[PDB]
Design an enzyme around this catalytic site. Structure first.
Site, PDB file in Angstrom:
ATOM      1  N   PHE A   1      -8.640   4.360   4.617  1.00 42.63           N
ATOM      2  CA  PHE A   1      -8.105   3.369   5.539  1.00 42.63           C
ATOM      3  C   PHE A   1      -8.910   2.526   6.436  1.00 42.63           C
ATOM      4  CE2 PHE A   1      -5.275   6.930   4.771  1.00 42.63           C
ATOM      5  CZ  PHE A   1      -3.883   6.407   4.897  1.00 42.63           C
TER       6      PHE A   1
ATOM      7  N   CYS B   1      -7.350   0.673   9.393  1.00 44.34           N
ATOM      8  CA  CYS B   1      -6.054   0.630   9.140  1.00 44.34           C
ATOM      9  C   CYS B   1      -5.262   0.964  10.440  1.00 44.34           C
ATOM     10  CB  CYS B   1      -5.477   1.209   7.970  1.00 44.34           C
ATOM     11  SG  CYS B   1      -3.633   1.178   7.741  1.00 44.34           S
TER      12      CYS B   1
ATOM     13  N   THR C   1       0.907  -1.303   0.024  1.00 39.14           N
ATOM     14  CA  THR C   1       0.015  -0.078  -0.074  1.00 39.14           C
ATOM     15  C   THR C   1       0.965   1.410   0.034  1.00 39.14           C
ATOM     16  OG1 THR C   1      -0.214  -0.101   2.384  1.00 39.14           O
ATOM     17  CG2 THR C   1      -1.797  -1.265   1.259  1.00 39.14           C
TER      18      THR C   1
HETATM   19  C1  FDE Z   1       1.246  -1.567   8.637  1.00 39.04           C
HETATM   20  C2  FDE Z   1       0.132  -0.913   7.684  1.00 39.04           C
HETATM   21  C3  FDE Z   1       0.485   0.248   6.972  1.00 39.04           C
HETATM   22  C4  FDE Z   1      -0.819   0.279   6.450  1.00 39.04           C
HETATM   23  C5  FDE Z   1      -1.187   1.469   5.426  1.00 39.04           C
HETATM   24  C6  FDE Z   1      -2.431   1.532   4.490  1.00 39.04           C
HETATM   25  C7  FDE Z   1      -2.317   2.125   3.298  1.00 39.04           C
HETATM   26  C8  FDE Z   1      -1.613   3.150   2.849  1.00 39.04           C
HETATM   27  C9  FDE Z   1      -3.589   2.238   2.921  1.00 39.04           C
HETATM   28  C10 FDE Z   1      -4.259   1.221   3.726  1.00 39.04           C
HETATM   29  C11 FDE Z   1      -5.588   0.728   4.020  1.00 39.04           C
HETATM   30  C12 FDE Z   1      -6.231  -0.178   4.555  1.00 39.04           C
HETATM   31  N1  FDE Z   1      -5.717  -0.638   5.509  1.00 39.04           N
HETATM   32 FE1  FDE Z   1      -3.892  -0.533   6.192  1.00 39.04          FE
HETATM   33  N2  FDE Z   1      -1.813  -0.443   6.820  1.00 39.04           N
HETATM   34  C13 FDE Z   1      -1.228  -1.365   7.592  1.00 39.04           C
HETATM   35  C14 FDE Z   1      -1.786  -2.148   8.177  1.00 39.04           C
HETATM   36  C15 FDE Z   1      -3.102  -2.607   8.401  1.00 39.04           C
HETATM   37  C16 FDE Z   1      -3.695  -3.516   9.590  1.00 39.04           C
HETATM   38  C17 FDE Z   1      -2.658  -4.380  10.299  1.00 39.04           C
HETATM   39  C18 FDE Z   1      -5.102  -3.923   9.191  1.00 39.04           C
HETATM   40  C19 FDE Z   1      -5.908  -4.494   9.727  1.00 39.04           C
HETATM   41  C20 FDE Z   1      -6.553  -3.945  11.194  1.00 39.04           C
HETATM   42  C21 FDE Z   1      -7.413  -4.560  11.889  1.00 39.04           C
HETATM   43  O1  FDE Z   1      -7.364  -4.210  13.108  1.00 39.04           O
HETATM   44  O2  FDE Z   1      -7.894  -5.459  11.487  1.00 39.04           O
HETATM   45  C22 FDE Z   1      -4.949  -2.714   7.986  1.00 39.04           C
HETATM   46  C23 FDE Z   1      -6.387  -2.135   7.357  1.00 39.04           C
HETATM   47  C24 FDE Z   1      -6.648  -1.497   6.295  1.00 39.04           C
HETATM   48  C25 FDE Z   1      -8.006  -1.477   5.525  1.00 39.04           C
HETATM   49  C26 FDE Z   1      -9.295  -2.071   5.965  1.00 39.04           C
HETATM   50  C27 FDE Z   1      -9.620  -3.288   5.118  1.00 39.04           C
HETATM   51  C28 FDE Z   1     -10.702  -3.969   5.633  1.00 39.04           C
HETATM   52  O3  FDE Z   1     -10.618  -5.231   5.903  1.00 39.04           O
HETATM   53  O4  FDE Z   1     -11.602  -3.481   6.429  1.00 39.04           O
HETATM   54  C29 FDE Z   1      -7.959  -0.637   4.422  1.00 39.04           C
HETATM   55  C30 FDE Z   1      -8.928  -0.046   3.540  1.00 39.04           C
HETATM   56  N3  FDE Z   1      -3.983  -2.107   7.749  1.00 39.04           N
HETATM   57  N4  FDE Z   1      -3.483   0.954   4.771  1.00 39.04           N
END
Ligand code: FDE
Ligand code: FDE
Ligand code: FDE
Ligand code: FDE
Lengths: 452, 455, 451, 454
Positions: free
Chosen positions: D392, D399, D267
């Site tokens: 996210f 995230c 990513t």
């Molecule tokens: C070390 C690291 C760095 C990063 C970065 C990033 C960028 C530039 C964009 C992104 C995104 C994302 N993530 Fe990210 N990231 C990470 C991680 C992670 C983990 C361990 C998870 C699972 C958590 C829980 O608590 O289940 C994520 C997670 C994530 C998500 C959610 C998908 C589902 O299965 O609901 C999205 C849309 N991420 N991301």
């Protein structure tokens, strides 16, 4: 998470719902609390709720920054004829804060002085009815308290005279209210509200709402025919954000709300006190003592009602043991953890078992079941949130001062004028609607031969 | 000259919304419009609009080359059950002009002559009911007008019988429908559509839309089975748009059926109901119309021709719809950047709201005697200034059912005057129920039968 | 960290038309009620925020974050009150200078000397009410104006206004009162250049001449043939810079003191007496306290400090209607008010004292009732909930003096008369910049106690 | 209006599967989204999902009281080598909460101060490498972004040096991981997992899990040979769940490493590669961005505080992930029966898929200039509607690595503008590599050093 919460016996897809298939649901929740402790999960077919009984957890749940007033399943059903009234409204609903700010004036200590006179009017009628009884007869206590409390709220609040003391079979309105309230409680137990067996019930209920809206909605017109009363505050008061007075239909909801809550809570409240007085004769003595000492005029004065300190203490000690509105509900404003042991998702429901809170042994000591009004000699010694007979926070009972004044006034006059006999040795039996009153409670009263 | 617009009291992130937290918003926007003058900005959380009250500004806004019909927040909420039907579609969406062109034949005069027969049927039923009342009984007018209009649109439009007069409790379809309109209204003001107070409303709202769709689907079944039918509905089914060739998809048919039921039954009930109010409160006016009735309706049942005679009755109805247009507002957006009335610059897409009640109260146009009910203002209608009287909307997006309605009220209002004398036995104070439409609430009368027979 | 409410706006004229009344302060209260503890108030070229809750007010009184601001109102008073104590910037040179030169005149020490002349003026009033015939009545704010003006003129400057020897108000009082009336009115004016206001400006210019011509009369009557407020102005030297006050600044302090005393204390006494006739139990409860303590023909300094219920009554009156209803503050540096409202350095605050004194969360649900018993344990009162005299180093220097004068006078009135609200007077609050009841009249029956 | 759900063409017993027998499904599902609108049903043999494209419906789908994170069919296949690691675990799986509350401390702003130094080191290696190029030499952007992101997650996360910059042929480790993701994605698309055509795949896939587990046990063993870093890896060995057990078991840890390495390098590199794309294609923005870098990066090497002060740079990055969210989708299921958007009923357990790229293209929210790259949309970030921008993820399963990733993108991208001028010398037409994550394929530029030293 740390602690898995207890839950009582479960009946398959019917969950623990059969556990309250008594005519005494609240008392059953107590019996469950007594064995499972400060918190337990209670599940129904469509809902889940947690019951709290220890002052420890209740202090947290009364945090207005984490929890708000929830409409329990019970209050949700009262919402069908009490609608948007203060008791059955959500906080963030548009008519709550609207109605709440206009009405607080009508229940401030300053407002009581005005209600005092009509309060007395109904209070003498009761005294006269008892004075005019022949010797072989007795007093049916809840019935006469219902006659009084309803006539008082109806007279003092809206200048309408129910004249309950001039009738023997109860008023159609009151009989309808009680049957409407009974239907709300009766639903709680139906895991099949669509089933045809409930058609006559659904019919009668719908007819009973028409009965209430009939009288009440006539009263709003019957006044447009203005004095200084609760109804005038509703017809004339203005909300500062839209500048409007209350809805015509919302007023109908408040009046219904006030009539029921007052007549049901206060009548139950007085009845319970009288039970404890005839069962605790020395407390009865000291209470009639102050009554005889303070109630020095043919009629009570507002100042004098305040000068009863022991009568008030019996009242507080009565509502402690059997709080006539036994419970309120809360929901988690956001995710949070209760008592550091029980995590809660946003929207999870809490139920406060006020009677069980009021029996929390660590708070009141080990004589929690004894009727000892001197616990209230020093009210500041009582811990914050240990004694919540009127709810909590902004959603606290708006009428607690009106109620205390009525109960203090009436109870004072009774103690001045009669001596009471538990002539049948009445065993305490609690009728449960949503509120709590005692049933079949009867006494005989010998008049102290004193004029009014 | 490029002057900033007034705006009423504003709160936190929720802007002007609390000002309109009533059960009567239009009556409140009026009492605000009266306070701020011909134009003001009204912001709600995430949306911005301008409310207009002077004919001066409205004349500018009715230029269809500069402003086009906009879907107000209100209409966006009815679109939740009326979808892209004629009332709640964008004038540039495919299904608008398609449906507009297939259905327009069904509302010109030439089509009206066909409806006249069934209109009389429903009216005789109303009169038959008022004849058959006992002596001290009363008439709940808005409720009986509701019975009438719903019975009238459903029969003329769809050859379906609600048989409302065979009921005491409103048709359940009306109960759900009114609560759906009420919900759209309330959703406008919700200070927090999230938090749990509104969960049963979600339940009710969907439950009520299902109710409407079922009987709609029953009307469509009733025809797939039952006929020489010159209908709104036959033009909806068999009708084909002459430009792309196709007929309506079923979904749009369903939205059109609901659309027609609702708009007719709500605006036309409010209209007649208001008409009676102003008549019963101004009895010489009632007298004047009450003789036009006796003079023109000289056969037991009215003919199509007789309805156009009733000039004053039309005048009464116009003055009523002027004071309380039951569809009180329509919305417009700026086709491009412009300056309105030379004072207010607007970016393309800014939305305008015409408070038709407040326009119809403009003193520079109507004079200083506005709030008085005088049907004689509508006697040289050509004397009435252009863009001053807009109860039926504007431009190509104007109410397609205007003449049908005017024909409906006049016929029904005419027969009422012919057959009864009306008593304001309650000294009723005017109470305006507000869903999105307007109509008087709790309005009651007593009616003395003139004992003239029917056919 | 949220956006602030704001009342109705009229385009380019902002919120200015909302206070195009004769009672702006009372109007700001109505606005506060609709919008709550805080709202923004904008005029063309000016912006200010009105605060109403002790929660936020406690913050604005943190002297390390906020300092005294001259509101647009005080800036207009500066046109005749100049760099005097009230209308000075905390950083201006003459403020700290005059503050220290003059503070000796407001210590407990100083009061005891003034008591004799304070009593003098009170006896004149009592003599006047006693000498009324039966059918006559008392015009209350007017007689309080006769009293308070004569009083400061005697204590401060050993000058006799002889107000009680007049039926037509003092010319000074007239010019001075419309000078405040003009200052207040100039605030709401959308078109300050318009010919409508040309006469007001000749008149304003004339009112200042009248006030200065009298002040010049006071100084010469002294520079003729006395340990008072005036000598400390003439002889005192600042222990920090070494110099006494310039002649210019003397004029402004004299004007400032006459006006500030006579206006705030006239309003206070009238409001107190207003509430007394309207709550007769309090009248009785306070009436007796006078008889119990004030046992000689004239009160002693000690006796007044014993009138405690009377002092409580006075305090409860200034709680409901503080005669100086507002003061303004600006942010010393960028800051956030109440965790909700970010403020850049220099943004202005306005404390709406009457609305502050109605914060139920502090005072309870019976704020509007006149109950002097709230002030028994004054230490029980949360800090920054009761601020009739401002805050901090810019707080009212004449505080304890006023309480003394009000108590002395209020007690003697209760000692010597019974009062009838013979008119059932409805409260009407006149607004210059200060507050005062306007049509207040009562009858007084003499208790025949002699002097 | 309680609407019938649109569904594209179904091919016999094979349902809609033939519709995504392309190499770029996410890019294809967007195309489908455009014809059918905000919602459509997509069925495959054994699977049913609903793909969402509008803010209207997404606002509802992110309500955590109604929906929980679902293992998409994709994630079900990734789970074959990520097991019960944070990404591919069910919310109710025991180890999810355990790992979540144990590891969250390692992404607090408290933690970035520690990572910053090692983050810079890898970033300098990048600058030095671009500076030491000869005149004809061009830069292959994605490949260098991969080297950078992987060396940085290994250094910050585990105090292990991949030293990718000392190589031109890819890590044996990274090619196996890249091929595992490419296979999971493709095994989603195959009609018959039985056909012998897939035996070599089944061989290679099982071989690639073998290498990944090999290298990972080397990392877990190499630290024992040391005993002192306060990092993700020490938090896994020392963190104990405050819920009922103590430490993380040695198998789930084996999975957290795989999960983090893969999640970061795929990513965060694709994101950076995308950030550079729009900069060379919209020179007005680049001018504006270098402007900010030149003024703010006032030390020979950037400091932790300085990074926070790079606003416009944050804006462009946010604007890049808006147009092309490198993790393009997440899945949800119905906790109970419900109605979606008032129109579409869902039984409990029904699955939803959020097309983050199509949502970030909703005209009603962002306006009619959906496609144009204007970083000025993100100067009032609090003005942006709630749930219109979800790169996210959402909720408790959003995230965990947002803080850290944005710290990297801001740090690295900042110096690039400090030290170089960028030419799209090939006039690169954008070609999006699709594994489960997205990423430009073949992006090339030339960079002239501003001769600024370190
Ligand atoms: C070390 C690291 C760095 C990063 C970065 C990033 C960028 C530039 C964009 C992104 C995104 C994302 N993530 Fe990210 N990231 C990470 C991680 C992670 C983990 C361990 C998870 C699972 C958590 C829980 O608590 O289940 C994520 C997670 C994530 C998500 C959610 C998908 C589902 O299965 O609901 C999205 C849309 N991420 N991301
Ligand atoms: C009139 C009246 C009277 C009364 C009385 C009484 C008694 C004796 C007791 C009582 C109680 C109570 N309340 Fe009562 N009451 C009343 C009332 C009321 C109201 C209106 C309410 C609601 C308010 C609010 O919260 O909003 C109440 C309220 C109340 C409460 C709470 C509820 C909940 O849910 O939370 C309680 C607990 N109450 N209460
Ligand atoms: C059937 C019918 C009937 C009717 C009636 C009426 C009355 C009484 C009144 C009225 C009105 C109106 N409408 Fe009316 N109506 C109708 C209808 C209609 C429709 C369909 C519409 C839409 C049209 C179009 O163009 O599309 C209307 C329409 C209308 C309007 C406009 C709207 C907008 O938004 O623009 C108005 C204002 N409406 N209206
Ligand atoms: C003589 C005198 C008297 C008086 C009184 C009085 C009364 C009753 C009330 C009052 C008040 C006051 N003040 Fe007063 N007073 C005075 C004064 C004064 C002065 C001088 C001042 C300024 C000071 C300084 O710090 O600078 C004041 C001051 C004062 C204040 C403040 C204001 C501001 O601006 O901040 C207030 C609030 N006062 N006050």
């Amino acid at each position: 998470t740390i602690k898995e919460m207890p839950q009582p016996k479960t009946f398959g897809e019917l969950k623990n719902l059969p556990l309250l298939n008594t005519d005494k649901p609240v008392q059953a929740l107590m019996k469950i609390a007594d064995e499972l402790g400060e918190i337990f999960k209670f599940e129904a077919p469509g809902r889940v709720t947690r019951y709290l009984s220890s002052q420890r957890l209740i202090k947290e749940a009364c945090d207005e920054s984490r929890f708000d007033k929830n409409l329990s399943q019970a209050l949700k059903f009262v919402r069908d004829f009490a609608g948007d009234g203060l008791f059955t409204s959500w906080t963030h609903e548009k008519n709550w804060k609207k109605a709440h700010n206009i009405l607080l004036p009508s229940f401030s200590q300053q407002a009581m002085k005005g209600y005092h006179a009509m309060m007395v009017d109904i209070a003498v009628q009761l005294v006269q009815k008892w004075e005019r009884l022949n010797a072989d007869e007795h007093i049916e206590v809840p019935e006469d308290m219902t006659r009084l409390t309803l006539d008082t709220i109806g007279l003092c609040g809206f200048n309408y005279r129910f004249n309950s003391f001039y009738r023997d079979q109860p008023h159609p309105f009151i009989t309808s209210m009680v049957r409407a309230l009974d239907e709300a409680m009766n639903k709680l137990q139906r895991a099949n509200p669509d089933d045809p067996a409930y058609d006559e019930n659904k019919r009668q209920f719908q007819e009973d709402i028409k009965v209430m809206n009939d009288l009440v909605d006539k009263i709003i017109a019957d006044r447009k025919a203005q004095s200084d009363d609760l109804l005038t505050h509703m017809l004339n008061g203005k909300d500062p954000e839209t500048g409007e007075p209350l809805d015509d239909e919302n007023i109908r909801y408040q009046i219904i709300t006030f009539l029921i809550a007052f007549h049901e809570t206060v009548s139950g409240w007085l009845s319970f006190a009288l039970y404890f007085l005839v069962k605790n004769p020395h407390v009865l003595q000291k209470a009639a003592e102050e009554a005889a000492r303070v109630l020095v005029d043919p009629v009570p004065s507002y100042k004098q009602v305040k000068q009863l300190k022991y009568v008030g203490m019996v009242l507080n000690e009565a509502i402690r043991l059997w709080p006539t509105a036994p419970a309120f509900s809360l929901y988690a404003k956001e995710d949070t953890v209760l008592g550091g042991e029980y995590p809660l998702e946003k929207g999870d429901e809490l139920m406060v078992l006020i009677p069980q809170l009021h029996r929390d042994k660590t708070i009141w000591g080990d004589d929690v079941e004894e009727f000892r009004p001197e616990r209230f000699e020093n009210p500041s010694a009582i811990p914050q949130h240990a004694f919540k007979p009127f709810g909590n926070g902004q959603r606290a009972c708006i009428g607690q001062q009106m109620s205390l004044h009525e109960a203090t006034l009436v109870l004072g006059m009774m103690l001045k004028h009669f001596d009471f006999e538990d002539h049948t040795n009445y065993e305490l039996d609690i009728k449960e609607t949503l509120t709590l009153k005692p049933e079949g409670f009867v006494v005989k009263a010998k008049s102290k031969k004193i004029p009014l």
